[PDB]
Design an enzyme around this catalytic site. Structure first.
Site, PDB file in Angstrom:
ATOM      1  N   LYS A 142      -3.607  -1.891 -25.376  1.00  0.00           N
ATOM      2  CA  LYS A 142      -3.920  -1.545 -26.784  1.00  0.00           C
ATOM      3  C   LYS A 142      -2.634  -1.517 -27.572  1.00  0.00           C
ATOM      4  CE  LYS A 142      -8.292   0.494 -25.601  1.00  0.00           C
ATOM      5  NZ  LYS A 142      -9.233   1.634 -25.660  1.00  0.00           N
ATOM      6  N   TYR A 196       0.854  -1.195   0.000  1.00  0.00           N
ATOM      7  CA  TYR A 196       0.000   0.000   0.000  1.00  0.00           C
ATOM      8  C   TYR A 196       0.885   1.239   0.000  1.00  0.00           C
ATOM      9  CZ  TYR A 196      -5.103  -0.384   0.202  1.00  0.00           C
ATOM     10  OH  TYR A 196      -6.429  -0.509  -0.150  1.00  0.00           O
ATOM     11  N   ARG A 200      -2.920  -3.764 -18.418  1.00  0.00           N
ATOM     12  CA  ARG A 200      -4.079  -2.874 -18.309  1.00  0.00           C
ATOM     13  C   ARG A 200      -3.859  -1.798 -17.251  1.00  0.00           C
ATOM     14  NH1 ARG A 200      -7.698  -6.756 -20.390  1.00  0.00           N
ATOM     15  NH2 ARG A 200      -7.890  -6.104 -22.592  1.00  0.00           N
ATOM     16  N   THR A 260      -4.900   4.557 -22.290  1.00  0.00           N
ATOM     17  CA  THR A 260      -4.638   3.224 -21.781  1.00  0.00           C
ATOM     18  C   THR A 260      -3.140   2.946 -21.902  1.00  0.00           C
ATOM     19  OG1 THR A 260      -5.070   2.230 -23.951  1.00  0.00           O
ATOM     20  CG2 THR A 260      -6.918   2.424 -22.450  1.00  0.00           C
TER      21      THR A 260
END
Lengths: 462, 462
Positions: free
Chosen positions: A238, A54, A244, A235
């Site tokens: 692609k 975190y 992602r 993004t």
């Protein structure tokens, strides 16, 4: 239990599913223009112990400790992002925490607009993305249109181009504070120089959403939106071939000083962009994703990636010509990027029917709507992209054999439509008629046999 | 270039970063209550070719093909999710696409509320989460407080417990449309029944945001909010020990009967929740994350995981007891879950000084606000969590050792405080004073030797 057992050992049901999906990707011809095949090295980072950390906040400005390494990874991702798009770290900054493409856009609006401020984006049926704004005539569909006020700018339905003229007219009246130049289903370049003019006039912000073409931009295979835009979002998958994720690029430093005395009116994007991402919208960064993006960004900086990018263009152009050669019509008149929009209407077929057929012989694309059209159930075209197969080392001759396989699919689809009625019959027909079935089963083998032969990025079995 | 090269070969700079972080995780005593160590099996699913698949939409309700396997995975994740929390599929539905915990909450709000509708959550300095709303006296900081109208409810500073009576009194006046039951920093069990009564009275939805405690809920070692809430969001990491993702649970079926005619009053959550996630807010699902979640979810159904969650409770209580025995104060006096809230004010040292000392000897915690705190730069407390170390097979005696070390670091921090003025002189002194750096290096080496001997979930090197 240690948490070190292998997936195949401890959850065989899921391992089976991953192998099935890995087989499916290897055995099929992948033409969904948004998809790509991500490298093993990026995947290795994605599934790393960075998932465990975190690190709410930003490098050197965290809210608790243990962030020595994730700080260096986040900064490395930033520098690699700026390098991959040839940007001066003095004129540009970048946020690498957006969880995906859509979240990157929502954070831009939140950073720069007030609720119900006005937004203009290319209409959905004209090849825009949902996050740019969409209301039916009864429902606000995109959250972008719940929280802000969007109005689409439209495609000239004869040139298949962006009607830059109307947009300037439609926009001087509507008064958006933000116009979005980017697309899903568009085969031509965007005129960011003109977008910036329409924007400098109505005093709007220029946002380039380059998701689909970001890899072409990094490889300098097409012109860069960073010349004109103040903000660019993308993004990381692609054509960028990453994991992602999402990125927000913003202009920083001094913008100009022609009005108030001489005080170099600084760009004020940086702080608002970063604050909107965190603390306003997101939570803990996904550090495994940030590392995987950094891996993909490094690859995109290399001569190897420019070569991939050119091959992408060549394979799209080769896909276009291959189709224009069997008489197919191309909205736009062809392409200048990684995809081609095929108007199946002149050949007496629709985008929906083609897709279900193609998919059944291990060819995957997406139906989309074409200029004019009508029923959103039976759209007018197919969207076809290079990047995926190009990453399997496909070449023009290879794509031409793809078109040939496609053409036998449409021909099954044209033939199937003469013997049936609605879209429900046309789909059951594909699976029901032993003659059409048996013909599909064979055409599949030819497609699978041909696809498997090529290499596949990633891990071997999953 | 095949994109099949290994990370250590193709990106040695990144590979070295992964190894440093792995070493940092293995040698540290990790006490950030939001952290855990994810199993290798889930991480293998995370870094898989599922990253390549675009599947916008939902199982069977997709917008294009190629979803055969991805559909089975998402449907499987849904089943394992309902089963992990022992939920009747006729009574409960689940959406597994939220990118993380924060997106899951924003999706619930957009699904159920109009812009500027009213929301109440636990005040952020009192232990609520940013996504529950937060405004300073001059700025709307949470996006929840930009797009919606938030007002907090508070702890009773006398008991350190949620002041349910004042929540009731105050909800009757504010009239929230949604009340949020869930915390970031709360050592006690929430009275979901009481919250249910307040929501029933003012006609609000009750959202249980169980992110911190979901693993304990799955294991049935604490009461379930599903007994009383309309909607339940969670992270899939934290105590669930999964990869980073999110979940929305919603009631479905018959809500109630009409007092007059049977009528049947159904729940209206399913369609709005799923519609808000996509198309309204998100893009393509992260199928690699969805699979990783499915893996973690199955682990959470086992006896192994119940045992683990029981041990988490025992270890947090052991840590609480050992802190009390050494004269520390605990907010609300103890704990009934995975964390304890230390009030360092009585010992004469603030949470910011203590967190930085602890960090320099490889003990990671976070400073946090205590009831009645007046400085955001010098909060008086430390949040400590048991889940991460429990996953490394720490037992009660090991947590007692952990407290021994903490106590040593506190004592060091006290001494440095007496030789320095401002916070920045404190932090400098830790690095630049010869005798102090020596004391810290000795403690750090003992901490790291102790920690390194316990097992670690994950891969061996990264």
């Amino acid at each position: 239990w240690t948490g070190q057992e292998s997936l195949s050992d401890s959850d065989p049901e899921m391992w089976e599913l991953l192998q099935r999906e890995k087989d499916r990707q290897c055995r099929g011809l992948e033409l969904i223009a948004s998809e790509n095949f991500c490298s093993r090295a990026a995947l290795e980072a994605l599934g790393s112990c960075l998932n465990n950390k975190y690190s709410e906040g930003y490098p050197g400005k965290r809210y608790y400790g243990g962030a020595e390494v994730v700080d260096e990874i986040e900064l490395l991702c930033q520098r690699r992002a700026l390098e991959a798009f040839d940007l001066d770290p003095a004129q540009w900054g970048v946020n690498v925490q957006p969880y995906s493409g859509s979240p990157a856009n929502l954070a831009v609006y939140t950073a720069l607009l007030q609720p119900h401020d006005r937004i203009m984006g290319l209409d959905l049926p004209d090849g825009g993305h949902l996050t740019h704004g969409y209301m039916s005539d009864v429902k606000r569909i995109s959250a972008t249109s719940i929280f802000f006020e969007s109005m689409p700018y439209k495609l000239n339905p004869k040139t298949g181009l962006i009607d830059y003229n109307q947009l300037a007219l439609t926009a001087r009246l509507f008064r958006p504070r933000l116009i979005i130049a980017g697309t899903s289903a568009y085969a031509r370049l965007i005129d960011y120089a003109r977008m910036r003019e329409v924007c400098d006039e109505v005093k709007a912000h220029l946002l380039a959403d380059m998701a689909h073409i970001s890899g072409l931009v990094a490889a300098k295979v097409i012109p860069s939106p960073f010349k004109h835009a103040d903000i660019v979002t993308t993004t990381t998958h692609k054509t960028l071939r990453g994991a992602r994720s999402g990125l927000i690029f913003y202009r920083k430093g001094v913008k100009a000083v022609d009005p108030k005395t001489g005080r170099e009116i600084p760009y004020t994007f940086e702080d608002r962009i970063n604050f909107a991402v965190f603390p306003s919208l997101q939570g803990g960064p996904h550090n495994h994703a940030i590392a995987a993006v950094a891996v993909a960004l490094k690859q995109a900086c290399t001569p190897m990636f420019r070569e991939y990018s050119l091959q992408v263009l060549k394979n799209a152009r080769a896909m276009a010509d291959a189709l224009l050669e069997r008489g197919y019509s191309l909205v736009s008149g062809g392409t200048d990027n990684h995809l081609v929009l095929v108007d199946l209407r002149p050949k007496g077929l629709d985008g929906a029917r083609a897709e279900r057929v193609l998919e059944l012989v291990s060819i995957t694309a997406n139906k989309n709507t074409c200029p004019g059209d009508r029923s959103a159930i039976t759209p007018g075209g197919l969207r076809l992209g290079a990047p995926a197969l190009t990453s399997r080392q496909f070449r023009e001759d290879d794509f031409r054999r793809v078109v040939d396989f496609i053409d036998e699919g449409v021909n099954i689809g044209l033939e199937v439509k003469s013997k049936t009625a609605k879209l429900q019959d046309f789909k059951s027909f594909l699976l029901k008629d032993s003659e059409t079935s048996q013909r599909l089963a064979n055409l599949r083998q030819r497609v699978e046999q041909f696809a498997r032969a090529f290499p596949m990025p990633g891990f071997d079995e999953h």
